[PDB]
């Protein structure tokens, strides 16, 4: 694919999000780089408006699956890179069990040699004293199913609650190409991810450091 050659080396990434959750408005800027040869992402996000009004882990999936490692034998199934450089639209609803939902709209595309993820997030029906607005989620993280001029993606995330329980986040996702060029429509398969969240000990702003590795599988 067209797109694939754009990802054979290290690519700079920018993430810009504007959010409103139950009327709590916020913005986040992220920077880092991706190396799809290793399925590797390294990013730092900063809440530029002050304190983030939701837990950082709940925004990880919102904050560039074009950096997934597709094994050679699965190359023909990589939608994400095939849409580049003109990019794709990514929309989700994320349903937090017994709490509210996020709806997101994003565009991911190249701006010059940099891969950019621009997002608008809207959250409604959260509980004031629930796990999200009450900041009861641990600062940690624990398959992503893809089907077929775009893709549909579905998966569950389990966020750890500070009492030892879990807060389920059911994800429903759709992606479509922004340009006219042909894209690769995949056979059913999944992505296997692992994420690690940390803090920069010299950073005083509200922030998250994210290290992720993602590999496509299932074929």
From Swiss-Prot:
Tissue note: Photocytes.
Disulfide bonds: none
Effect of residue 188 to I: In mut2.1; shifts fluorescence lifetime from 3.03 to 2.50 ns
Impact noted for substituting residue 29 to R: In mut1.28; shifts fluorescence lifetime from 3.03 to 2.76 ns. In mut2.2; shifts fluorescence lifetime from 3.03 to 1.94 ns. In mut3.3; shifts fluorescence lifetime from 3.03 to 1.88 ns
Effect noted on mutating residue 161 to V: In EBFP1.2; shifts the excitation and emission spectra to shorter wavelengths and increases quantum yields compared to BFP
Outcome reported for the amino acid change (mutating residue 63 to M): In RSGFP4; increases fluorescence and shifts the major exitation peak to 489-490 nm
Impact reported for residue 193 to I: Suppresses the 475 nm excitation peak, leaving only the shorter wavelength peak at 399 nm. In H9; increases fluorescence at 395 nm excitation
Free-text biotechnology note from the record: Green fluorescent protein has been engineered to produce a vast number of variously colored mutants, fusion proteins, and biosensors. Further generation of mutants led to more stable proteins (at 37 degrees Celsius for example) with brighter fluorescence and longer fluorescence lifetimes.
Effect noted on mutating residue 101 to T: In EBFP1.2; shifts the excitation and emission spectra to shorter wavelengths and increases quantum yields compared to BFP
Effect of residue 196 to V: In EBFP1.2; shifts the excitation and emission spectra to shorter wavelengths and increases quantum yields compared to BFP
GO biological process, any: bioluminescence
Modification after translation: Contains a chromophore consisting of modified amino acid residues. Maturation of the chromophore requires nothing other than molecular oxygen.
InterPro entries: GFP (IPR009017), GFP-related (IPR011584), Green_fluorescent_prot (IPR000786)
Gene3D superfamilies linked: Green fluorescent protein
Annotated phenotype, changing residue 142 to I: In ECFP; leads to cyan fluorescence, folds faster and more efficiently at 37 degrees Celsius and has superior solubility and brightness
Effect of residue 144 to I: In Azurite; shifts the excitation and emission spectra to shorter wavelengths and increases quantum yields compared to BFP
Effect of substituting residue 124 to V: In EBFP2.0; shifts the excitation and emission spectra to shorter wavelengths and increases quantum yields compared to BFP
Membership in a protein family: Belongs to the GFP family.
Protein name as catalogued: Green fluorescent protein
Species this protein is from: Aequorea victoria
Lineage, top ranks: Eukaryota, Metazoa, Cnidaria, Hydrozoa, Hydroidolina
């Amino acid at each position: 694919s067209k797109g694939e050659e754009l990802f054979t080396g290290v690519v700079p990434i920018l993430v810009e999000l504007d959010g409103d959750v139950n009327g709590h408005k916020f913005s986040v800027s992220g920077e880092g780089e991706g190396d799809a040869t290793y399925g590797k992402l390294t990013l730092k996000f900063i809440c530029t408006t002050g304190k983030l009004p939701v837990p950082w882990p709940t925004l990880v999936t919102t904050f560039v699956q074009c950096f997934s490692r597709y094994p050679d034998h699965m190359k023909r199934h990589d939608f994400f890179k095939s849409a580049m450089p003109e990019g794709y639209v990514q929309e989700r609803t994320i349903f937090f069990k017994d709490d509210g939902n996020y709806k997101t709209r994003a565009e991911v595309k190249f701006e010059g040699d940099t891969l950019v993820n621009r997002i608008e997030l809207k959250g409604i029906d959260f509980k004031e004293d629930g796990n999200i607005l009450g900041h009861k989620l641990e600062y940690n993280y624990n398959n992503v199913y893809i089907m077929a001029n775009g893709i549909k993606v579905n998966f569950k995330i389990r966020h750890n609650i500070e009492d030892g329980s879990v807060q389920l986040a059911d994800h429903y996702q759709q992606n479509t190409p922004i340009g006219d060029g042909p894209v690769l429509l995949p056979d059913n398969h999944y992505l296997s991810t692992q994420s690690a969240l940390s803090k920069d000990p010299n950073e005083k702003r509200d922030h998250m450091v994210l290290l992720e590795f993602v590999t496509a599988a299932g074929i």
